[PDB]
């Protein structure tokens, strides 16, 4: 089997991408944030505290003839940005782009933090990291990809995120028309539960490539590119007037500036992030200070190849017995 679904930016800055997902019988379609940095499929639901729902579409398990309470199971998750959610669990039929999994754990939110309530465009998350990170207790549950894997033509999914445009998540096949040149594959460590890999270096603009190992994760659920402070300083030093602002929370730059590209290495190959992908716009409406899309990871504990980096590439998440990541230009 295969599946193929369009993913659409939630706003004009590509802050996140939503993909329609069919849950239950008859289908209830919710727009979920596919997140290769986490491993829970959770939704706003008829059980979510009413004051914490503000425009989202909810899953109502009582209206699904295939929903079953997973008795005794609870979940609770906290994300790198400080947001969180928790609740109980049903199993139900879940389909993405024509690919159907029966008995998928659907984590029903009883509580969500304010950032989720305040974003009416995201109805939940669909985690695509390794199932060892799933938070369901006392019996950890498998991700959608883990459940679908055996049925897929090939045990892979691909992320093809658009810049200011829709893109595609495919499951079970690699669309050879969706990229240019060849795909370069690189080793993955699953020891932390992430799609963790080692970039071979970077370049700023037309500058010389610096060969240096940068361990980080491929995370579709994080907006920006978070890299070591040395690398980030070298980038922003090429933008006149750019500075790190403690009050804003990272590097800002004059909105009048033209940004240089940023290149990252995948083995001997190179992925170029155009400068315009690094512009996240005014820090507040009408401001001439703009927020940068490359930020320091020094306070995170891990480097993160978020959407800024991934949307410059066609990315293969190879879930074979020994997983690997592939990157191609497009």
From Swiss-Prot:
Active site, UniProt feature: 35, 199
GO biological processes: proteolysis
The keyword Signal appears for this protein: yes
Peptidase A1 domain boundaries: 17-328
EC number: 3.4.23.22
Domain of life: Eukaryota
Catalytic activity field: Hydrolysis of proteins with specificity similar to that of pepsin A, prefers hydrophobic residues at P1 and P1', but does not cleave 14-Ala-|-Leu-15 in the B chain of insulin or Z-Glu-Tyr. Clots milk
Keyword match Protease: yes
Coiled coil (UniProt feature): none
Entry's Gene Ontology molecular function annotations: aspartic-type endopeptidase activity
Keywords: Aspartyl protease, Disulfide bond, Hydrolase, Protease, Signal, Zymogen
Disulphide connectivity of cysteines: 255-290
Family: Belongs to the peptidase A1 family.
Protein name: Endothiapepsin
Organism field: Cryphonectria parasitica
Upper classification of the organism: Eukaryota, Fungi, Dikarya, Ascomycota, Pezizomycotina
